[PDB]
Every structure is written in C-alpha cells, then in structure tokens.
Amino acid sequence: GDTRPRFLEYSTSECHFFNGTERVRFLDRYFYNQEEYVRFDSDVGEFRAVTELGRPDEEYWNSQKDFLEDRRAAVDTYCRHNYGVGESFTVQRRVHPKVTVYPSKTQPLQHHNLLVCSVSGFYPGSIEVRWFRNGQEEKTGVVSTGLIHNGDWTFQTLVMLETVPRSGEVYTCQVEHPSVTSPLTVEWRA
Amino acid sequence: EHVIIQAEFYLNPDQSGEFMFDFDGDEIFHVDMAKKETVWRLEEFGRFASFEAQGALANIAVDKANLEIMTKRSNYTPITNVPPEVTVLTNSPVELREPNVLICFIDKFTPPVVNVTWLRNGKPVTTGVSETVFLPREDHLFRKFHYLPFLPSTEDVYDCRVEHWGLDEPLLKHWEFD
Amino acid sequence: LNVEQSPQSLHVQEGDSTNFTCSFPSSNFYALHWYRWETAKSPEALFVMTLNGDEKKKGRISATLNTKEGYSYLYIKGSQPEDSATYLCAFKAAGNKLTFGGGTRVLVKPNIQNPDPAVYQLRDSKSSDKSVCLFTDFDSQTNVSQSKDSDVYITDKCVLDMRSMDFKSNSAVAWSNKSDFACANAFNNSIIPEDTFFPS
Amino acid sequence: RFYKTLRAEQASQ
Amino acid sequence: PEVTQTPSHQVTQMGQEVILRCVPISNHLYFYWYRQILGQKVEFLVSFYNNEISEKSEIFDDQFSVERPDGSNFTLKIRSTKLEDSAMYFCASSRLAGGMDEQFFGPGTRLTVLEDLKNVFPPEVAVFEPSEAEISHTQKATLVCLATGFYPDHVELSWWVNGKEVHSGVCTDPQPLKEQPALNDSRYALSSRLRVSATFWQNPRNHFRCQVQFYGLSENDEWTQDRAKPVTQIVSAEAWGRAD
Numbered sequence: 082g083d084t085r086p087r088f089l090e091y092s093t094s095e096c097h098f099f100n101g102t103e104r105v106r107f108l109d110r111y112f113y114n115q116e117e118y119v120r121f122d123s124d125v126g127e128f129r130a131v132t133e134l135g136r137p138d139e140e141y142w143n144s145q146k147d148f149l150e151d152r153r154a155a156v157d158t159y160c161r162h163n164y165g166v167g168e169s170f171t172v173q174r175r176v177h178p179k180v181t182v183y184p185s186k187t188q189p190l191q192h193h194n195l196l197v198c199s200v201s202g203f204y205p206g207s208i209e210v211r212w213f214r215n216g217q218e219e220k221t222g223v224v225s226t227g228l229i230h231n232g233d234w235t236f237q238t239l240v241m242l243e244t245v246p247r248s249g250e251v252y253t254c255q256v257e258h259p260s261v262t263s264p265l266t267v268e269w270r271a
Numbered sequence: 272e273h274v275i276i277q278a279e280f281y282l283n284p285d286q287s288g289e290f291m292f293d294f295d296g297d298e299i300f301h302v303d304m305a306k307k308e309t310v311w312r313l314e315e316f317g318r319f320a321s322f323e324a325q326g327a328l329a330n331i332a333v334d335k336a337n338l339e340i341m342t343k344r345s346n347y348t349p350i351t352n353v354p355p356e357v358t359v360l361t362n363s364p365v366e367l368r369e370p371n372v373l374i375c376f377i378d379k380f381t382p383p384v385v386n387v388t389w390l391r392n393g394k395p396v397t398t399g400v401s402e403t404v405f406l407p408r409e410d411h412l413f414r415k416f417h418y419l420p421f422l423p424s425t426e427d428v429y430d431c432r433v434e435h436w437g438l439d440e441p442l443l444k445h446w447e448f449d
Numbered sequence: 450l451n452v453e454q455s456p457q458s459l460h461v462q463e464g465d466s467t468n469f470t471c472s473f474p475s476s477n478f479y480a481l482h483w484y485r486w487e488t489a490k491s492p493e494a495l496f497v498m499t500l501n502g503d504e505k506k507k508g509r510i511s512a513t514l515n516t517k518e519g520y521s522y523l524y525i526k527g528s529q530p531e532d533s534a535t536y537l538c539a540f541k542a543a544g545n546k547l548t549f550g551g552g553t554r555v556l557v558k559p560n561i562q563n564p565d566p567a568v569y570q571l572r573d574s575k576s577s578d579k580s581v582c583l584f585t586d587f588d589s590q591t592n593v594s595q596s597k598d599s600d601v602y603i604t605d606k607c608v609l610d611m612r613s614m615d616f617k618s619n620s621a622v623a624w625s626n627k628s629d630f631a632c633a634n635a636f637n638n639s640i641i642p643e644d645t646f647f648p649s
Numbered sequence: 650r651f652y653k654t655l656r657a658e659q660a661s662q
Numbered sequence: 663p664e665v666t667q668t669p670s671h672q673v674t675q676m677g678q679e680v681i682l683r684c685v686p687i688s689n690h691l692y693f694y695w696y697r698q699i700l701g702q703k704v705e706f707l708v709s710f711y712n713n714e715i716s717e718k719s720e721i722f723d724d725q726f727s728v729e730r731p732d733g734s735n736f737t738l739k740i741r742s743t744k745l746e747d748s749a750m751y752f753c754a755s756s757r758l759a760g761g762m763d764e765q766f767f768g769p770g771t772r773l774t775v776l777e778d779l780k781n782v783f784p785p786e787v788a789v790f791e792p793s794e795a796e797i798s799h800t801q802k803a804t805l806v807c808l809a810t811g812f813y814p815d816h817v818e819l820s821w822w823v824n825g826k827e828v829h830s831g832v833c834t835d836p837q838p839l840k841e842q843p844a845l846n847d848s849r850y851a852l853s854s855r856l857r858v859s860a861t862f863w864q865n866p867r868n869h870f871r872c873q874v875q876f877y878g879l880s881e882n883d884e885w886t887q888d889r890a891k892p893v894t895q896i897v898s899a900e901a902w903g904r905a906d
C-alpha cells in the first residue's frame with residue numbers, strides 16, 4: 082500500500098468568548114505535524130515559540146509590525162466581529178428535542194429490562210435529562226452515553242434506567258432544555 | 272462561553288488543503304478547493320451571512336509555502352500516524368420502514384486523510400451519501416462524519432469501511448436492526 | 450466593488466488648509482490605502498488605514514477612518530506647491546487586490562510675490578518670423594484662457610521656481626504663423642492688468 | 650455581513 | 663528601494679503582441695499589474711504569489727498572461743492588442759503574504775495602441791532666445807522651448823545647461839495642446855521655459871539645450887511612406903550665451 086512519509090502544516094485561529102463578548106481570549110496557533118511550534122496569545126501581546134522549531138517565526142513575525150498589529154487587533158476586528166456575524170443562527174440557534182421512551186428488551190416483569198430515554202435532534206448541547214420511579218427521582222441505576230455531536234448542528238443522548246418492574250409501574254423521563262419553556266415529560270407503562 | 276475556530280491545513284505529498292470555520296464543535300462553512308467556492312454546512316447559513324472565498328484561497332497558498340519551509344526546517348521529519356476510532360450510530364432511535372440516517376463517526380486521527388465506503392450486504396452504496404470535512408479537536412487530532420439515509424429492514428446488514436495509514440488492515444464497523 | 454472620491458478636482462492657495470473625502474463599502478472591510486501621485490512620478494503610498502476612529506499623520510498630511518459609515522478624510526495642513534498631486538484612495542477586501550477611487554486632483558496655487566506683469570517677444574536661435582510671445586511675472590489671481598482663433602496657440606499658466614534665487618514666477622506662451630500676429634493682441638481673451646509692461 | 654479570514658503570513662526561511 | 667519598469671513608453675499597432683517588463687522589490691512576496699485608461703480609474707488586472715496567479719480581473723485571462731522568467735523579473739503579455747488597451751500600465755509589489763501592508767508601484771509603461779502607424783510623427787524642436795527688453799527690465803532671462811507636430815502624445819522634455827540636466831528655473835506644460843482639435847489623431851504641441859539671471863545668459867561660455875524624447879515606431883515595424891521613419895528618437899535645439 083501507500084507507505085510514503087506525510088508532512089502536515091496545520092493552523093488554528095481560536096476565539097474564546099466569556100460573559101458574551103465582555104472577555105475575549107484570542108489564540109493564533111501553528112502546528113507542524115502533531116507538534117505546536119509557535120503561537121500568538123492576546124494575553125501575552127506578541128508571538129512566542131512553543132518549541133525550538135518555532136523560534137525563527139517568533140522573532141520574524143514580531144519584527145513584522147503590520148502582521149503583529151493585525152494580531153493585537155484580532156479580539157475586536159476578527160473575534161468580536163465574527164461573533165456578531167453568526168450570533169442569530171449560532172448563539173441564538175434553538176432546536177427542541179424529540180423525546181422517545183422505549184424498553185431495550187421485551188423481557189417479562191419481576192426480571193430485568195433497561196428503560197431507554199432517547200433525546201435526539203436538539204441544539205444547543207446544554208441538556209438535563211432525569212428519570213422518575215413514579216414521582217420520586219431515581220438517581221441510582223442510571224446509564225447515560227453522554228452528549229453526542231451528530232455533525233449536522235444537532236445533538237443526541239441515550240439515558241438508560243436499570244429496571245425491575247412489577248404489575249403497576251409508571252416510569253417517567255423529564256427533559257429540560259433552553260429551547261423549551263415547560264420541561265416536557267414522557268410516561269411509560271409496563 | 273462559546274468558541275469560534277478558523278481551521279486550515281495543507282498536507283504533502285497528497286496536495287490536499289483545507290479551510291473551514293467552526294462554532295462549538297460544529298462546522299459553519301468550508302471552502303471547496305477544486306470549485307474555489309464557500310460551502311455552508313446548512314443551506315440557510317448562506318442567507319444569514321457572507322464570506323469571500325479568496326481570503327481562504329490566499330491562506331491555503333501561504334500554508335502550502337509554510338509546509339515546504341517547515342519540512343526543510345525539521346530536517347524532513349514525517350508525521351506519526353494515529354489510527355482513528357470508528358463509531359456507527361443512527362440519527363434517531365431505529366424503527367422499521369421509518370426513514371433514518373446512519374452516521375459513521377471517525378475520530379482522534381492524524382494525518383487528515385481517510386477512505387470511507389458504506390457497505391450494505393457487502394456491496395458499496397453511494398445514494399444520498401454526504402460527508403463533512405476534517406473537523407478540529409482540542410488535542411490537535413481530527414474528526415469526520417459520514418452519512419447514509421436508509422430504509423430500516425430486518426433483511427439488510429450495514430458496514431462502514433474505514434481506511435487510514437495508522438491501521439494494520441481496513442476497519443469495518445457493523446450495524447444491523449435489533 | 451466600488452469606491453468614490455470627492456471632489457474630482459481641488460484648487461487651494463499656498464498656506465491654506467484643505468480636505469477631501471473617500472467613500473468605500475462598509476461590508477468585508479480589511480484596509481483603506483492612500484496614495485500621492487505626482488505628475489511625472491509613480492504613486493507613493495501615504496497611509497494604510499485598518500482601525501476605526503484611528504488617525505495617522507505623515508508630516509502635514511492627516512487621515513481619518515470611519516468603517517461603519519464607510520468614509521475616509523485626507524487633510525492637508527498649510528498647503529505647499531510640493532503638495533500638488535492626484536490623491537488616490539484604495540479599498541482592500543479579504544484578498545490583496547485594490548479597488549481605486551477616481552482620485553482628488555489637488556492644485557496648490559503658489560504665493561506670487563513682487564508681480565511685474567509683462568508680454569515679451571522671443572526670437573528663434575535658427576530664425577525666422579515664427580517667434581513666441583511670453584506673458585510672465587503676473588499674480589495667481591490672473592487666469593489665462595483659450596486662444597479662440599485656430600491659427601494662434603496659447604498654453605495654460607505654468608509656475609517656475611528659481612530654487613537658488615528663491616523666486617517663483619507664472620508664465621504662458623503664445624505663438625502663431627501669421628504676418629499680422631503681435632504680442633500686443635496675443636493675450637486678448639484674458640483679463641490682463643493695466644500695469645502690464647508692453648516694451649516699445 | 651461577512652465572516653473575516655484571519656490572514657496568514659509566510660514563515661521565516 | 664523601488665519597483666522598476668521597462669520601457670517607459672511603448673507605441674504598437676492594433677492586433678500585435680506586447681511584453682511589459684517589471685523588476686519588483688527583491689524580497690517582496692506579492693506582485694501585481696494595474697492599469698489606467700486616461701480619464702478612467704486605476705484598475706486591478708492580476709496578482710501573483712509563490713509562482714501562481716492569486717487574483718485576476720475580467721479584463722485579464724483573455725489573451726492576457728504573466729511570467730516569472732527568474733527570481734528577479736516579472737512580465738505582462740497582451741497577445742493581441744486592442745484600441746481599449748491604450749493605458750498607463752503599473753507594476754506593483756508588496757512584502758507580506760498576509761496583505762496587511764502597502765503596495766509599492768512602478769513608474770509605469772505608457773502603451774499607445776494605434777489602428778494605423780502612418781499617424782505617427784516625430785516632433786520639431788525650437789529654442790527661443792530671451793527678449794533683451796526682459797533683460798533691461800527684470801535683469802532675468804527666460805528661454806522658451808517649443809516641441810511641435812508630434813503624434814502620439816506623452817513626450818519627455820528636458821533642459822540641459824553646460825552638459826547637465828537642470829530642474830531649477832524650469833517649468834513645462836503638464837498637458838500638450840492639439841494643433842488641429844477637429845481631428846481624432848491630432849498632432850500635439852508642447853512648450854517649456856528655463857529662467858536664468860541676465861548675467862548667466864550674457865556669458866558666452868554658457869551653453870543651453872532643449873531635449874525632447876519621442877516614442878514612436880519600433881526597430882521591427884512597417885514603414886512604406888516617403889518621409890523618414892518616426893522611430894523612438896531625441897529631437898534637440900540649442901542656444902549659446904550672447905553678451906549683446
């Protein structure tokens with residue numbers, strides 16, 4: 082097969098926003114293969130070499146006054162600007178979750194089955210999914226897969242409850258998400 | 272707390288380049304290297320915002336030049352291959368006949384080159400097959416999503432075949448209705 | 450896509466200050482450049498404007514930038530004849546290409562001291578008949594107009610500086626291939642001061 | 650409104 | 663530390679090929695070509711970075727090409743010249759690959775594309791001796807240089823005193839006048855003045871010369887007419903000092 086050596090030049094320009102746009106930390110990072118060699122941190126004000134490989138770029142880019150000025154102004158001209166361009170469909174993007182409650186197996190009562198609470202196709206990632214025995218919060222025996230990116234601007238979570246059912250059982254899944262005013266519930270019967 | 276990332280790369284001898292914008296792990300847009308035009312992740316983003324593809328194109332040329340400068344500086348040191356993790360899941364819980372999407376998630380790999388083929392009953396499938404570009408990561412590795420719209424049935428078996436230089440043999444991740 | 454400069458032409462007296470404007474797109478802004486282009490010379494870069502509300506100064510020339518409204522002002526303080534040039538503004542987007550305005554052609558009228566308006570006749574070093582009429586040593590307020598007659602040719606006013614002798618003077622040349630043609634009738638179309646010296 | 654590319658500079662040769 | 667351009671001016675026939683040469687600043691990364699049709703705006707044509715075209719205009723691509731012969735020269739080629747191609751062609755360069763810096767312009771190449779080369783005429787140059795009345799009145803002496811009947815426009819007039827070019831006491835018209843304004847290809851006229859002190863003009867050891875650099879037909883062109891070939895030439899006139 083293809084065994085030829087590979088060489089990668091990778092770069093990231095990061096804008097980290099805190100308390101809206103009140104605090105902005107800007108990072109311009111350069112990578113050769115997996116190794117970071119040089120970076121510009123808005124908290125330091127200039128370019129600094131991460132490894133010895135980044136030393137020529139550190140002294141050269143800091144000497145280039147127009148390029149250094151562009152980086153020192155990035156917090157407002159680049160970071161804060163792009164935040165504003167996206168804001169409406171980015172920070173203000175709201176998609177309500179589809180909540181489905183189903184048992185993992187069709188096993189009989191008094192034995193065991195895993196109760197699945199599927200929370201799919203929602204945005205943002207902030208979600209609180211809770212399980213209830215009848216009306217009392219069940220904290221023990223809860224198996225969650227955590228937050229999952231679908232890569233199409235939607236998330237999904239599979240929260241499972243370890244269940245030993247008997248005759249008259251009413252398990253309920255409560256989901257609270259910024260897109261919904263009222264926390265939507267889904268009831269399941271044996 | 273939010274994060275806006277401008278991610279760009281150039282790889283040799285592959286001559287593959289990339290420029291994309293990311294918002295909290297999700298792609299806002301990318302620039303098609305062959306067509307030289309802005310490709311928005313969701314069609315609606317093209318109505319709400321604009322972008323000059325030339326700014327991206329000028330940056331790709333600089334990364335191409337810098338790659339040459341960095342290779343020569345490092346005494347021609349190559350990248351160490353990091354094999355990917357392959358996961359197959361569905362867009363929503365699976366129900367027979369009810370339309371769904373099979374998602375093949377390729378994660379924590381370098382270099383950003385991968386061959387992904389969908390396999391239904393051992394045969395390659397291309398109908399409605401969409402894919403994302405190489406997405407950034409905090410540990411400076413890459414992510415990739417592959418999609419397959421499908422009609423769930425007890426008759427069909429599915430597989431995501433992943434080829435990467437860090438793998439001993441092509442990785443196959445199985446999926447079937449249960 | 451489009452940049453506009455106002456005014457197209459500008460006349461200013463020596464020592465007095467002027468300003469002119471540049472209008473550029475408010476969308477996809479990266480930089481606004483200013484160039485000074487003197488007649489026989491190449492365009493010389495004056496300023497690179499990136500930051501909104503930031504003012505830069507290059508001697509007696511100042512520049513302001515307003516990104517939101519999409520305007521730039523260039524100020525010339527105590528105008529000197531050396532400041533006479535076409536001032537061009539150029540907008541830069543995400544690439545490198547510059548979108549230029551029409552420019553503001555600035556003409557600094559010099560301070561004419563010790564005026565001695567006179568019309569002289571100059572003869573050819575090779576001869577004959579075709580001689581030139583020179584209207585010289587007049588003030589900047591005096592304007593030279595077109596010939597009106599096809600057989601007579603009149604050049605516009607032109608200022609010379611005797612640098613070593615720290616003296617400046619205005620002049621216009623008139624010539625014709627006519628037997629009737631004389632320096633006394635040559636500058637008829639323009640308002641010549643009564644004190645103009647016509648030699649005997 | 651336009652998203653702005655953070656322009657990249659050539660490395661020290 | 664500036665951009666160099668050769669030639670200063672060029673005159674060619676419609677449909678012919680032109681090659682404009684440029685020497686960008688040695689360490690600069692980006693190279694450009696801009697053009698200005700007289701009365702129009704300075705227009706972008708092409709940009710060049712790392713042996714490849716970055717941006718190009720709608721004016722460019724069609725019969726327009728750029729070349730990097732070596733690591734010092736940059737050229738612009740127009741395969742088939744049109745009447746609309748008559749302009750001042752500027753070569754530019756900038757240091758940074760990021761583009762957040764000034765663009766340095768070359769002196770330019772004035773290109774005149776003509777339908778017919780028969781319209782081309784060299785100038786006639788005459789020096790006019792200063793009036794003795796002016797010497798007796800101001801104790802100053804002004805010489806007048808007249809360059810007449812030239813086509814095309816954009817000549818270079820210069821004064822030379824005792825074998826050296828002078829700029830002090832000199833003033834030349836910034837625009838030439840049309841001899842026959844009722845014509846599309848009218849022959850031009852241009853004047854200039856050189857003012858010296860009467861003492862300087864009276865000295866017979868002092869020499870005065872007016873030079874006009876004309877740009878016309880090339881050393882590979884069609885000339886079938888009776889009169890002399892209107893090639894790129896320097897037409898001169900002179901005057902020596904007179905006591906009187």
Ligand SMILES: *[C@@H]1O[C@H](CO)[C@@H](O)[C@H](O)[C@H]1NC(C)=O
Binds near residue numbers: 346
């Ligand atoms: C560079 O690469 C070659 C080949 O492995 C080797 O000869 C040399 O030791 C390396 N290091 C330096 C500093 O040249």
Ligand SMILES: *[C@@H]1O[C@H](CO)[C@@H](O)[C@H](O)[C@H]1NC(C)=O
Binds near residue numbers: 083385435436
């Ligand atoms: C991927 O696709 C191409 C074309 O067949 C090939 O160069 C490469 O070897 C393939 N395999 C891997 C692991 O990338």
Ligand SMILES: [Mg+2]
Binds near residue numbers: 309320321322323
């Ligand atoms: Mg767009």
Ligand SMILES: [Mg+2]
Binds near residue numbers: 495505
């Ligand atoms: Mg400046």
Ligand SMILES: [Mg+2]
Binds near residue numbers: 511524
């Ligand atoms: Mg001011």
